[PDB]
Design a protein around this ligand. Structure first.
Ligand SMILES: Nc1ncnc2c1ncn2[C@@H]1O[C@H](COP(=O)(O)OP(=O)(O)OP(=O)(O)O)[C@@H](O)[C@H]1O
Ligand SMILES: Nc1ncnc2c1ncn2[C@@H]1O[C@H](COP(=O)(O)OP(=O)(O)OP(=O)(O)O)[C@@H](O)[C@H]1O
Ligand SMILES: Nc1ncnc2c1ncn2[C@@H]1O[C@H](COP(=O)(O)OP(=O)(O)OP(=O)(O)O)[C@@H](O)[C@H]1O
Ligand SMILES: Nc1ncnc2c1ncn2[C@@H]1O[C@H](COP(=O)(O)OP(=O)(O)OP(=O)(O)O)[C@@H](O)[C@H]1O
Ligand SMILES: Nc1ncnc2c1ncn2[C@@H]1O[C@H](COP(=O)(O)OP(=O)(O)OP(=O)(O)O)[C@@H](O)[C@H]1O
Ligand SMILES: Nc1ncnc2c1ncn2[C@@H]1O[C@H](COP(=O)(O)OP(=O)(O)OP(=O)(O)O)[C@@H](O)[C@H]1O
Ligand SMILES: Nc1ncnc2c1ncn2[C@@H]1O[C@H](COP(=O)(O)OP(=O)(O)OP(=O)(O)O)[C@@H](O)[C@H]1O
Ligand SMILES: Nc1ncnc2c1ncn2[C@@H]1O[C@H](COP(=O)(O)OP(=O)(O)OP(=O)(O)O)[C@@H](O)[C@H]1O
Ligand SMILES: [Mg+2]
Ligand SMILES: [Mg+2]
Ligand SMILES: [Mg+2]
Ligand SMILES: [Mg+2]
Lengths: 216, 217, 216, 217, 217, 216, 216, 217
């Protein structure tokens, strides 16, 4: 129930703001005074501290937190050393931001609980949108299977779900349609799709992509 | 097989370049750092050392040829800004740019950036939902209220059937898939069973899902 | 009636001193303490502040000023970001100093009310004096027409305005003559011109330049 | 067709070089930065990379050939100073130098600079008159007391004649020109009309003009 | 005649390289500083300028050929760390690394360093025993309790025999050697004499030796 | 009885900790505040001071100490100048850490009492272990003679000291055997040696090395 | 009677110490706090001040001093600007240290009362000692004439002034002989010169140098 | 025609080099800065870019050939120190070195510098005597008590004879020379006259001269 966020960068700042917005106890820690002041209004508490300094860590009472997030990026040494201190303080859950393949590996070795690559991961998602302008967002069930949110084109305007027989034609299933903000869940065969609506389809990627090539 | 130009081979842009090329697209990698160009040389169609703030070098790249130009310059906001400005004045159709903060976004907005992205900001949200709720593995939002969520089944859910968990009536949700031992099951029948540490895909309203988590899981 | 001058450089310093000299309420703002102290005696109020910091801007009560001048030069990012903050604070009149063609463009895009290029503009004026040692100062009515202040040579000593029939000979009109500090406005045909006096002529540039080549 | 040397291709000196050359004069652009030389190469007769504090490189430029040498070095006051000192000792006829502050002016004065210029200081004054008085577009001072001013006509002045506005008797001033829609009118007759957002050129004493502004406009 | 690679030609690694080569071993000296490579060129089998954090340059060295690779990078802990990480992933049998502090040791421990060394830390102890006890010249610890010590004989011990100093019965220790004027004596007989400023080698328990020092010396 | 340690680096830090552990009066001196704070708990007293500043030296009352250790490394000039000040303050025993051959020489010239090369010296010791994996630790009696601690191999398991007739076969003598932590001093001819035990041998290096080649 | 020394470097420090030693009122001014503290005991007053800052100059009451010495070296701009401020404060006597030929020239132009080149001047003196090991010290009366202090060699031991008929042989005159510290002024013809004594000779340089070549 | 090596072409060493060469001596100028070497190239017999802390480059200079080596390195005390140390170990006969402070002198003293010089310190004294006493132009000290001084004659001394000013009896001093309008007079007769703004050379005890100044001048 107690969260600590060390390193109030673009990543950690988002985490801190979002966690706090959910009504959780969040401690924001940063070496820069300007940052601390900025996120003071976004954290339960905001304290200036050097996280590579063990005494300051104890001063924070950091052992009390079940989750501690190290979102230090540019200074790879600081990121590494901070996590190490935390593990030696027997912190249950330590999530750390990684800068490259090698940074992930050392964090792996020293007992980080979960390592994240925000930029590397988003890069993939956006690339998928670049290659395929139709795709708005998606989630991968596996290497082969995914759920995709498509932006309906002119070709689909005023067409029905039975008209788009994705179950037989593409082996897929329509999960939702979003029109002008209104949402429809598990839509009936009588439901109509208009242009520039959001269409949620489920199935194998190649089957979905094929629906895009032929259908959309 | 469109033509992409990627300016700024950082953690973000690097991923884009590697991923775009992997799909078999024509991608030009451009960076001011010579060491980077060598590194991503094996991942791009062409890799060229260039300063994107330099108009002559920009024309030398033949940037007019590209329908999509990606500005993935982060740390140097002025360079990020100045690059986009040149690109807009070169009448590039689609200019996608990485933003560092709220104000960087606004300036990119004003000078006519086509798509602005906040990788860290967006991931912060995604990760935060997992921090607050260890059960959620991944998700997608259909709207402000409705979302599709991938759940990690607990001991509490072991060996239970979909008809036993009538989420359609009890929680107004629907199970979309179950992933067991790597094997995947789509549109599972009411007789299908769920075991612990499997991946469970549920669809519905946020509050309805969270309630299922508190009571079911 | 309320003026704010941010960035007390060579440009802003001149503005601040000159505005204050006219008896206007001027707030001088600079990140450098030495500057603030220096222009303290030249401003109504002088306050140390980082203009890229939004809270300090509100602390200044900058919304209260009808005119805010951003005279930050070297740090182009600061100049840009400051103006942006001001526009988002709905400041009526925002005048900003530009460093180059590109800086003008972004300031243009983000809603600057007037953009100025002090060095670029003066460069032209001085170049005109370099090419033509006779010219002291001028103003352009258009691309073709201008009013010019000439330094009278030996060729013009003790000559009259009717003797210099600029209305017929060059299609121009003499507006003023300055002798030893004494000024003459709308001078009569009987007025005499002595060497090293200031002569103010009006007409087309080529006609004026021709008067210089032939007359002076 | 005199010979000009321009040392310091900054915002100021750059303008000078571009403008002088545009008039068809022989201009030599000299700068310590190689990137600058390339940039202004297209705007100068000759463009040479050189350190103006280096006497041998100075002679290599053949600076003795120039009747006018412009020192437009600003930020580096020592370089600005040291360049002028060399030039004076090379018996250059006319040495014009950019000054950064009051004291820089004094030293340039003492070592025999022929013309010292304060671009920002001078513009500050010009701009300030427009800030305090939005009606004034541009102006020139005949003396400490008398000036010629270009005014932006308001709604209050729309469709009024010059004889209706007898500024010669009422304010002791004279209208010199009216600019309408780009079209220009010189020495306008008393029957000539002025419409809003036109350019109005008035001549007289400062207080007389300002009074006309308060009452007329 | 094993194969050694020495990364980091510092005070520590430099000594290693010089000493290993002196014994007639194949040693490859590798350093990022070009000046260093030249300096230790005369002390290594091969001397190559290389960045040990660069994987391609690492393979170029043929580091796989070496059974022993010594990371003697100190000041730059990230480089020290990153080098070891690469080496472990290249499946190098024995990787010995210099540590700067306690935490640097831990990370080296976790990523599978085979031997970690603390030269300054270890010497600090050795030197400290001489500071506190000027009589001890050098020593070796058999355990936490038992050690072998080299003592500097005082005036108090001059011309005394080993049978006169029955350290075996009186202190439970044994004299192992006496060094006189450079001449060395091993397993000295009970009749052997000790003169001042000679080197005396004693073996036993720490407290027993120190007591002999207080009473004997 | 009074010790001063100037320069709390890796070397000096070890000295300070070890001297203090022995229950000696130790004054830790460092220019860095973080260091001083760190070794505050390891020194009798810890004081921030610049040792190149003579007044601060007198302020420490440094004349009172019989032993002063200068463990400044990176800044060779500071190391040199500090020692010089100390000698001019007539300090009895001044021990100084050296960085290179040349630093030793100047310290030699200005009257340092003992000069130490920690890294250079350890380099030799470790190299001996690299070349000979059997060697754990050693001490040199001279250029030729040494006492060596060997790690017993399979070849020596369950063998006796008379079986290893080092007195006749190699002209050496066994001094101790360490088994599972238990130690044996001046071991009897009946004593057994098991694998991975610690074996202490005394004699000429070549004789010992030969025992390793043939015996072990 | 009032002296100010700005810039407590090697040059200014010597001046300040030497002037103060003579019992004069000396104000030491330096931007570096450590310097100020150091020369505090050597000045009547020692004050931290930036001499390029006009207000601090007035704060010192620098107009009160008849002599102000600017001994700023490395920062040529500071040296120049300081002197300029002083001249504009109408300081009677302004002595300034110069770094090069060009620095002398600008100081010349802005009204420095005396400009000094300590290093350049000493360089000559020492060079004269290098070329001629016999010369200890000297003073030039002109380009041709000088007074020289010579170190007597073996060739001159136990020789008399009439024996060294410098008035006829070399056209010179002996002014003094220094033996073991004892000094002799206007020495008589009976005075003896012993080896390694100090001999003071007056005349033309070439005549003196010739005496060295032939006599000494 | 001895052989001189000059390390450190600063204000001090530069003067030495120029002056030594002017007298027609073989002088080798050595400096780490390439720009300096070019500058003093015209003033030295040979001018070579070299790092004096580099032993190999030092031998490359053939520094053993020189009987005199001048270390005129100031700012970088470690380089100044390290250079001298190398030179002493190369058994150079006479090593003259510039000192920056008291402690730099001591270290140079200890490592066997043959002559140590304090240009600024020495000049400070000379200049100070002129500051306190505007009448003195230049001087030389015979000892702690006795000195020879060059005085600037005032109005008070105009048209006075040497017999009128019997400094030999009245002040125990002697006039050595009078310089008038550039013309010089040595061993002037008692009938010789002194006019204002001439140069007057007086010899004697410091207090005797100063007293003559107070009373005579
Ligand atoms: N030693 C430290 N202790 C605590 N906080 C630190 C330390 N070093 C850096 N930080 C903080 O961590 C924050 C994030 O670091 P930084 O912004 O350099 O990483 P980044 O790669 O830019 O991350 P992002 O991708 O989120 O922008 C910074 O705000 C910084 O103040
Ligand atoms: N003017 C320029 N011209 C060309 N390339 C540039 C320019 N400025 C920066 N870059 C390149 O852009 C790349 C991305 O910038 P950088 O990685 O510093 O941003 P970042 O905030 O760290 O992004 P990420 O979050 O992906 O780490 C850099 O590798 C740099 O080489
Ligand atoms: N972030 C900031 N907030 C407020 N003031 C700033 C900031 N950054 C710089 N300034 C101030 O703006 C002033 C002008 O900037 P600067 O002098 O570098 O521009 P410049 O190009 O030299 O302008 P000029 O042409 O007038 O000399 C400086 O005095 C500086 O103190
Ligand atoms: N020693 C030198 N030799 C030759 N060129 C020089 C030297 N020093 C500076 N310059 C050049 O002078 C140019 C003008 O200087 P700079 O632009 O820094 O002055 P500024 O105050 O910024 O002027 P502006 O107000 O025009 O921006 C610089 O572009 C620089 O390349
Ligand atoms: N990335 C790298 N690749 C190759 N060599 C490196 C790298 N980083 C550092 N080195 C080299 O490692 C050497 C040793 O590092 P350094 O001497 O700074 O450590 P140290 O703590 O000073 O060790 P010592 O105690 O021996 O002085 C340096 O000489 C440097 O040239
Ligand atoms: N002028 C000074 N006065 C006092 N202490 C100083 C001074 N300069 C440096 N020190 C201290 O000396 C300590 C050791 O110096 P440093 O660590 O740079 O040497 P090192 O070569 O790294 O030594 P080691 O081999 O022990 O790591 C540092 O902690 C530093 O704070
Ligand atoms: N702006 C300033 N105002 C006052 N004092 C200053 C200023 N800048 C420098 N100084 C002082 O002037 C002193 C002399 O300057 P510096 O030592 O750099 O010249 P230098 O060439 O080394 O002179 P020297 O030949 O005597 O060693 C320094 O102690 C410094 O603190
Ligand atoms: N390691 C080195 N090898 C060769 N030359 C060097 C080295 N270090 C310094 N020098 C040269 O010595 C010269 C003199 O040093 P520097 O002029 O900085 O001393 P300084 O105190 O300024 O002397 P001065 O009082 O004459 O100005 C410098 O020009 C520099 O080029
Ligand atoms: Mg990032
Ligand atoms: Mg400017
Ligand atoms: Mg070390
Ligand atoms: Mg000097």
């Amino acid at each position: 129930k107690q969260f600590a966020v060390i390193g109030l960068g673009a990543f950690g700042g988002s985490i801190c703001k979002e966690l706090h917005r959910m009504g959780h106890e969040v401690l924001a820690v940063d070496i820069n005074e300007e940052k601390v002041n900025a996120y003071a209004s976004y954290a339960t508490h905001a304290v200036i501290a050097n996280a590579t300094e063990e005494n300051e860590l104890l001063s924070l009472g950091i052992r009390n937190f079940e989750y501690v997030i190290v979102a230090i990026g540019a200074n790879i040494q600081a990121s590494t050393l901070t996590t190490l201190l935390l593990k030696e303080l027997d912190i249950p859950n330590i999530w750390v931001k990684a800068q490259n393949y090698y940074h992930h590996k050392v964090l792996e070795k020293i007992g980080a609980d979960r390592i994240i690559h925000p930029e590397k991961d988003m890069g993939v998602k956006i690339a998928q949108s670049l290659s395929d302008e139709n795709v708005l967002n998606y989630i991968d069930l596996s290497d082969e299977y995914s759920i995709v949110e498509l932006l309906a084109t002119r070709k689909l305007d005023s067409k029905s779900i039975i008209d788009l027989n994705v179950r037989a034609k593409y082996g897929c299933t329509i999960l939702a349609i979003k029109h002008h903000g209104d949402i429809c869940l598990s839509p009936a065969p009588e439901d109509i799709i208009r242009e520039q609506d959001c269409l949620v389809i489920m199935g194998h990627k190649k089957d979905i992509k094929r629906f895009e090539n032929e259908g959309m």
